């Protein structure tokens, strides 16, 4: 991510959003709402996979800063995995 107009909604907000998406929610009433939720991955416009689970995440802390203290650039490393083994006919549809 690199900021051009508003650093908070571009660089300093996306990191918090990812950090929230990776975590569970243990105060929910139902059992299924406590598990970390799953996301939909769409690489460009041509590869789309559903029910993707986020496993790892990382980012640096020596990025350039704005006069107000928000990042002007950052980089996040992610590892993602599927939730089931795919059949030969199903995996072709993903492309």
């Amino acid at each position: 991510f690199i900021a051009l107009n508003n650093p908070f909604i571009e660089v300093s907000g996306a990191i918090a959003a990812l950090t929230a998406m990776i975590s569970p929610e243990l105060k929910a009433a139902n059992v299924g709402g406590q598990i970390p939720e799953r996301v939909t991955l769409n690489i460009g416009r041509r590869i789309n996979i559903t029910d993707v689970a986020i496993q790892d995440l990382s980012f640096d802390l020596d990025a350039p800063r704005d006069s107000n203290g928000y990042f002007l650039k950052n980089t996040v490393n992610l590892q993602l995995t599927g939730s089931s083994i795919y059949n030969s006919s199903d995996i072709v549809r993903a492309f």
Partner: protein
């Protein structure tokens, strides 16, 4: 009141946005940030799929096949202060 140490003063001219502070009931330590700091978090999901099956009651079978959530890890840091 804790005891101060490090580069806490402003005589050097660097913004407080470029410093770290560690505070407890006894000491307060201030330092800079070097070139190799990062923040990491991780979660555990469970490798081998399975066989002798596939399936065309039905819903429960698939739920077992789906990856399971096992546990997590609190965030960790690696900070080269200076």
């Amino acid at each position: 009141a804790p005891i101060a140490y490090g580069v806490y003063s402003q005589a050097d001219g660097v913004s407080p946005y470029l410093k770290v502070t560690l505070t407890n009931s006894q000491y307060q330590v201030t330092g800079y940030i070097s070139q190799g700091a990062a923040m990491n978090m991780a979660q555990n999901w469970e490798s081998m799929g399975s066989v002798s099956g596939a399936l065309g009651t039905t819903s429960v079978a698939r739920w077992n096949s789906l990856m399971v959530w096992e546990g997590g890890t609190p965030p960790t840091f690696t900070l080269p202060v200076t």
